[PDB]
RNA sequence: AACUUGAGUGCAGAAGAGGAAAGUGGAAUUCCAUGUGUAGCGGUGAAAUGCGCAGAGAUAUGGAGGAACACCAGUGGCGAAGGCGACUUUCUGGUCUGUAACUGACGCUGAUGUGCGAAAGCGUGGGGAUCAAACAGGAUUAGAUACCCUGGUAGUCCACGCCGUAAACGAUGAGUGCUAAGUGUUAGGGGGGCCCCUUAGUGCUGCAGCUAACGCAUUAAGCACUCCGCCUGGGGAGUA
């Protein structure tokens, strides 16, 4: 906000894999402050995962983080009658925070049978550049490839 | 600072004396202020008439 | 040819016309910002006239041009992003004079507005 | 009758976009003709009208025409005011400094009068580049006979006349003399590049004093004398 900086409240380790990424990603399958299922629904998807693609579960994961995770975003200026959208680099805590976010939301917005197989699902298709969670990082370079002409009006 | 005018004494600035001129006029010809050449009022106006003068009979550039 | 073509740039409040001529005031090529795609507020953008100088640039070298003199005519945003714009192309830019035409009055200066 | 200080004349100097006429230039705008040249140009907050593909914009050369004179250029200068900036020449007005050669009050103000008087406007005849009232569009708005954009006519220019109005303002009549200072700048003079003194302008602070206050203050809105113009609550009305 105005006054400085707000610090961050940070996770533990994940009980199973050792990784902060992880838990993170159980912060946001939790509906309703239910941690148990969505502790369940990662289980039920790392090792799932490990049966359609062949490698570590958490090896796979790592892959496909790095393409859902955007590298420059499009923060919005203003002159007047038109609003600039000035392409920004993402920093990379923010990086971690949209991945995470765009695997969850274009894992819930397909369907199968289960939250259990689509996290699974779209785990592997982000691996392999497929998906909506890789289709809207490639939406948000776009954005930020179209408006280089605004590059010089990052405030 | 000192006129260059009044210190050696000239009194009829001559606009046949080009070279004289050349130390008032700048990379363009342009007159250059009094401020910066530090002559007189007095001597800023005759001096004027000269540079306009050399400017008409082609001694003296117009732009350079 | 084979060297000395003198470039023309236009850099105004609107798009930055580069024109690149012979030593003689004859055209070989030319690329403004408009005929890039660029859209106004994109138009007079440095960005915008990097790729408008570099564009007219790789034109000339299809000429054999090896030595390109900057003659700048406007108080226009993109113009310092336009010449090295034309030295990132390699085009050994010897002289940058401006011609912005300056009247000794003798006209009306058109009204400004409100 | 007499006198010079007032006012003028004489002599020696000074500066000035003061005025009128005729010439001579350079930069720039527009248009035209070509060479090169290719798909845009231009404009906005975004647009679009608009100009282009019948070759525009750009670029180079040349030509035609009109208008105004960058730099110098400043609380700078001149003029009664309005106003006066390119250079040259010819006519021509005013002002300042010094001297004290001459006249010995020849002075001030000034109703009526008579002239000058920014822009805009009118008539006649020219000229017409640029910008343009009005007019056309294209937009914004709920509407937009407006601000924005694209063009565009009179006018803007010249010569004669007419008009005689402006926040034509220092919102401060003209003349004369007196009344603390400080510090600049313009044009001279006299003394010992510097200092001092001094004359006339032009500025900024600032005393006494004045004012309702703001403020003015040796360039008064202070202190005095002469003359002219003007005012007597606001509308109706600068209208009959």
New binding site residues.
């Given amino acids: 906000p105005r006054k400085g900086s707000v610090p961050k409240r940070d996770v533990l380790p994940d009980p199973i894999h050792n990784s902060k990424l992880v838990t993170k990603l159980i912060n946001k399958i939790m509906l309703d402050g239910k941690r148990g299922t969505a502790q369940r629904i990662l289980y039920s998807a790392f090792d799932l995962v490990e049966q359609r693609s062949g490698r570590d579960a958490l090896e796979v994961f790592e892959e496909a983080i790095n393409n859902i995770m955007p590298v420059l975003e499009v923060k919005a200026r203003r002159?007047?009658?038109?609003n600039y959208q000035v392409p920004v680099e993402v920093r990379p805590e923010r990086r971690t925070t949209l991945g995470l976010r765009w695997l969850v939301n274009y894992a819930r917005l397909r369907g199968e049978k289960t939250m259990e197989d689509r996290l699974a699902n779209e785990i592997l298709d982000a691996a392999n550049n497929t998906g909506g969670a890789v289709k809207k990082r490639e939406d948000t370079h776009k954005m930020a490839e179209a408006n280089k002409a605004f590059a010089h009006y990052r405030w | 600072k000192?006129?260059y005018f009044?210190?050696n004494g000239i009194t009829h600035i001559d606009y046949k004396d080009t070279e004289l001129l050349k130390r008032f006029?700048?990379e363009?010809?342009?007159?250059?202020?009094?401020?910066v050449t530090g002559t007189?009022?007095?001597y800023?106006?005759?001096?004027?008439?000269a540079?306009?003068?050399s400017?008409?009979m082609?001694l003296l550039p117009?732009?350079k | 040819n084979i060297e000395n073509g003198?470039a023309?740039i236009?850099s105004?409040?609107?798009?930055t016309?580069v024109?690149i001529?012979?030593e003689?005031?004859?055209?070989?090529?030319?690329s403004?910002?408009?005929?890039?795609?660029f859209?106004?507020?994109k138009?007079?953008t440095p960005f915008a006239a990097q790729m408008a100088s570099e564009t007219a640039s790789k034109?000339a070298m299809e000429h054999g041009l090896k030595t390109v003199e900057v003659?700048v005519?406007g108080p226009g945003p993109g113009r310092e992003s336009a010449i090295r714009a034309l030295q990132s192309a390699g085009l050994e830019v010897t002289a940058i004079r401006d011609?912005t035409?300056?009247?000794?009055?003798?006209?009306?200066?058109?009204?400004?507005?409100?």
């Fill in positions: 002159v007047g009658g038109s | 000192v006129c009044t210190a006029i700048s363009r010809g342009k007159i250059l202020p009094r401020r007189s009022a007095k800023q106006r005759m001096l004027t008439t540079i306009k003068r400017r008409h082609a117009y732009v | 003198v023309h236009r105004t409040f609107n798009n016309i024109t001529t012979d003689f005031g004859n055209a070989l090529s030319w403004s910002a408009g005929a890039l795609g859209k106004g507020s138009k007079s034109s003659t005519k011609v035409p300056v009247p000794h009055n003798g006209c009306r200066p058109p009204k400004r507005r409100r």
